[PDB]
Amino acid sequence: GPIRLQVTLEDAASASSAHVALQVHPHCTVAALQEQVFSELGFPPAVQRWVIGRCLCVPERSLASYGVRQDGDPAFLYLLSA
């Protein structure tokens, strides 16, 4: 079922005021999360670079592949400077 993912937004300019928690299915793909953040938080997927642990994520794989297990698992969304 759904899990609380701890996204920390990271930018070219950044030091932690802005954190975000997103309910995501570990069996859902990183692409699906990208579309989720696009509709929800307004970030186009072309600028999105997801980091989970020691991996720059590929949108074809599942969050479980990196992997999202428990709730509160931390992820980082690096946004590109368009």
Binding site: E10, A12, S14, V51, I52, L56, D73, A75
Partner: protein, 129 residues
Amino acid sequence: RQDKMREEGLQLVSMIREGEAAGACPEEIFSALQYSGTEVPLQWLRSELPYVLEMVAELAGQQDPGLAFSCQEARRAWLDRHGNLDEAVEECVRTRRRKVQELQSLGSLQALFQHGGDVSRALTELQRQ
């Protein structure tokens, strides 16, 4: 206890920011780390990468000749496959086959090599006599 996941994440985000400030895209930093985990990927790009791209080009040209590869095509495949050399070579010969197939008339091969796999730069330059 224990979410060192956040530690590794912060580390990679650090190297990604440092790379972005030096003109390196995150795929370059990550590909450098995934292909022989150098603790500095910025030095590794300038230092160890040229022979690796040359490797992608040599294996790629040897796999399905005649369709020579440019350093730009090998670099693009290498980055598009996050550093996976075999996937990089495969996508390299695959993309080049796509590019020679895409042309209207030629088969020619020198034009794609000479312009780094740019379909329309090789297309404009090969329109000459």
